[PDB]
Amino acid sequence: DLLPASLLQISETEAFSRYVILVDKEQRKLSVFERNGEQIQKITEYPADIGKMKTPEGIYFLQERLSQPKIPFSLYGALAFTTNYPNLFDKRENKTGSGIWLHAIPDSVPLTRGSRGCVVVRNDVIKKLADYIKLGETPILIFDHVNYVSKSEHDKRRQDLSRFVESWRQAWENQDIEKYQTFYDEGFKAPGFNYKSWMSHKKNLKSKYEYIKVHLSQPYIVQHNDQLLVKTLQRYESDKHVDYGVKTIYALKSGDTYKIIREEWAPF
Amino acid sequence: DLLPASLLQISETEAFSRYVILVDKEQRKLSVFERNGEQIQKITEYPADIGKMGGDDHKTPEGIYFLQERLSQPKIPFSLYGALAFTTNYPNLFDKRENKTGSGIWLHAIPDSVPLTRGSRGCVVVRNDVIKKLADYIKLGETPILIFDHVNYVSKSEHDKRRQDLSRFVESWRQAWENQDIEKYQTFYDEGFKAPGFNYKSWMSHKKNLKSKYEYIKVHLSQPYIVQHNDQLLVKTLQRYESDKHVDYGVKTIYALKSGDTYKIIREEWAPFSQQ
Ligand SMILES: [Br-]
Ligand SMILES: [Br-]
Ligand SMILES: [Br-]
Ligand SMILES: [Br-]
Ligand SMILES: [Br-]
Ligand SMILES: [Br-]
Ligand SMILES: [Br-]
Ligand SMILES: [Br-]
Ligand SMILES: [Br-]
Ligand SMILES: [Br-]
Ligand SMILES: [Br-]
Ligand SMILES: [Br-]
Ligand SMILES: [Br-]
Ligand SMILES: [Br-]
Ligand SMILES: [Br-]
Ligand SMILES: [Br-]
Ligand SMILES: [Br-]
Ligand SMILES: [Br-]
Ligand SMILES: [Br-]
Structure with missing residues (x-):
């Protein structure tokens, strides 16, 4: 019925990503949208939260895929996807810090125990999300507030x-x-x-x-x-x-x- | 006969670059070194200078960089860059830790009628004939460019x-x-x-x-x-x-x-x- 006001169009170019990941921090939800010609449409959604161990908002792309043994399962679950944070808007104002990843965490651990500003999902969820991600191409939009419009x-x-x-x-x-x-x-x-x-x-x-x-x-x-x-x-x-x-x-x-x-x- | 003290070895891995570019600001020289097993060998050398425009200590960045992209007309103006420019990864991780970064660093050329120092502050500038020769040695994403205020040559x-x-x-x-x-x-x-x-x-x-x-x-x-x-x-x-x-x-x-x-x-x- 409603669509996110901030994602207006997905590129038709097939070398880019047909999917966009939208993280709504207030709703604790991560949604996947896909191009449908000039339109967009929601494909799926999953719970997500922001690591707590203000958090950044912005318009990012996913860059690399990481897993064991390079990264510890105890902190990241089975998979992490890095971003291009800080982007050009962030650098314009000299933003730095540890960085923003999309990652998982053990089932026994709350999603908010991830590192500050990271997008954290369940281990089963990150394995499904991996299928939507084209490395170097798929946007991840991380917003405090998402306005849904007709x-x-x-x-x-x-x-x-x-x-x-x-x-x-x-x-x-x-x-x-x-x-x-x-x-x-x-x-x-x-x-x-x-x-x-x-x-x-x-x-x-x-x-x-x-x-x-x-x-x-x-x-x-x-x-x-x-x-x-x-x-x-x-x-x-x-x-x-x-x-x-x-x-x-x-x-x-x-x-x-x-x-x-x-x-x-x-x-x- | 003597060799630059700071460039100790070039990697044997062919996915990287067998060439290294060394810029000596004091001598106004740019040299190309090639791997020779565990040794290094200077293969060529040309005049070079650092751009001074649009920069209080009057100094420019020095460091250990890699060349990333190749640019030419019509993307970039010949009046500023001559026939070719190569971008770098400046600021690198050392520079980010110091957190005093300035304008970008490129290796580029300039029109024949103007001094090399008309380049933008900190860029490595060479003549048009030189930049075309250097293009033959540069593997994008891999070739180092070492930009040093001084170079200590040792036995x-x-x-x-x-x-x-x-x-x-x-x-x-x-x-x-x-x-x-x-x-x-x-x-x-x-x-x-x-x-x-x-x-x-x-x-x-x-x-x-x-x-x-x-x-x-x-x-x-x-x-x-x-x-x-x-x-x-x-x-x-x-x-x-x-x-x-x-x-x-x-x-x-x-x-x-x-x-x-x-x-x-x-x-x-x-x-x-x-x-x-
Ligand atoms: Br407008
Ligand atoms: Br297209
Ligand atoms: Br592409
Ligand atoms: Br929700
Ligand atoms: Br490693
Ligand atoms: Br820029
Ligand atoms: Br500003
Ligand atoms: Br951060
Ligand atoms: Br992190
Ligand atoms: Br688990
Ligand atoms: Br939880
Ligand atoms: Br993937
Ligand atoms: Br799929
Ligand atoms: Br929105
Ligand atoms: Br353009
Ligand atoms: Br006008
Ligand atoms: Br790092
Ligand atoms: Br000349
Ligand atoms: Br040296």
Whole structure:
């Protein structure tokens, strides 16, 4: 009936993850959602809690799978999955610490006896969750509060953010520098760039390659509190040359809209 | 004839890099070294400098890094980076422990008309012809770049002595672990040790628990990379671990700091390895 307001869309790209794990700390529940075309749908849910031995919230991806004998069953159960904590939003504010894993624990031990901020589930549960996880790809969203909205409200929020992404893509493809610039925060950073050098490079590229095409696959879209994360397979065509890459934008709320603070690209 | 005191050995493991890049800030030189068995051999050398732009002590980071990604146009501007850039893993685990990290470090080029020092603060900058030559030696994710304010060149005799000294340290650690001599093994670790999921106490408790269950283990290490510079020691090896229950192979990286006349491990990483 209802859908999580902060998970708006799962990417259609099959090299990414068709599943997203959503941890609702207030409900003590971990849910698995799957793409259904442009829609999302809940597949399953399990009890979960946060280790207690404020805890972080954020938008993460699962990276590695660990088990015995590398990690002790007494602390982690049969399996642990690491995350990319601290992410770029976390680093922007110098967040560090022991890290965030999704892991299990012995049956005799409460889930809250896990290490602080880790997501802890039962040993039987982690073995089932492993089947949904594509290492390096599957998101894990860890939120204090999850607002559930009607399907019609969810569709509206998704379309609102889809229009934001499209207006950005269009301004980029048009090489309409004046419009494109407005999507970026003056504190923007990317590897090798600040706001000024990023815009200067975009203007210089336009001077060399007048016509470009930018295509974005149906993206992951997550929007929780101030944060917006969009991840897509991007096709860039310019000067009869082409490249495909994984494009991730990180943005923060700015008045009634958002401004991009970080932009990443990796070859695909 | 002389050899850099800080680069003691290159790993024999072909999944890693047989080449190491060494940057000597004082001499404004970048050299390529290649593994020759247990020895190292300098194969080429070019001018290089450190970028000074957009940086009060006026100094730039130094350390023991690995090259990660290769970038070129149209992703990055030629005006700033010339024909190619290679990113690093800066800040590494040593840098994170010191918690005074700055702007990123790349190895890149620049237009022919401008000085190498126009690069951004701390980057290693070379000419366009040079960066294209270096690309032939760089294995992404594997090739070290050692960025040192100063380089101490020593005799081959002195170099081999230092290499053997550190090899004996590593072997002593390996033997203590393999013997599951917990008293001896513990002496190799700093009390502030951390690894993913562990501190000193939980690391030692896990090792003691494994010992209680699996009486005899085997630990084998491929000939390691060994770098020792300033307070830091980095050892990287392909490790085979065997108990009666399982065998695993993985990449083992040890980060250690000087302690009196020896070293204590502050971080220890393992990543699984497979051919198949
Ligand atoms: Br796709
Ligand atoms: Br991928
Ligand atoms: Br619940
Ligand atoms: Br800030
Ligand atoms: Br944490
Ligand atoms: Br159990
Ligand atoms: Br419980
Ligand atoms: Br898995
Ligand atoms: Br499944
Ligand atoms: Br939500
Ligand atoms: Br304009
Ligand atoms: Br960044
Ligand atoms: Br908006
Ligand atoms: Br891009
Ligand atoms: Br030249
Ligand atoms: Br040296
Ligand atoms: Br660590
Ligand atoms: Br942990
Ligand atoms: Br290990």
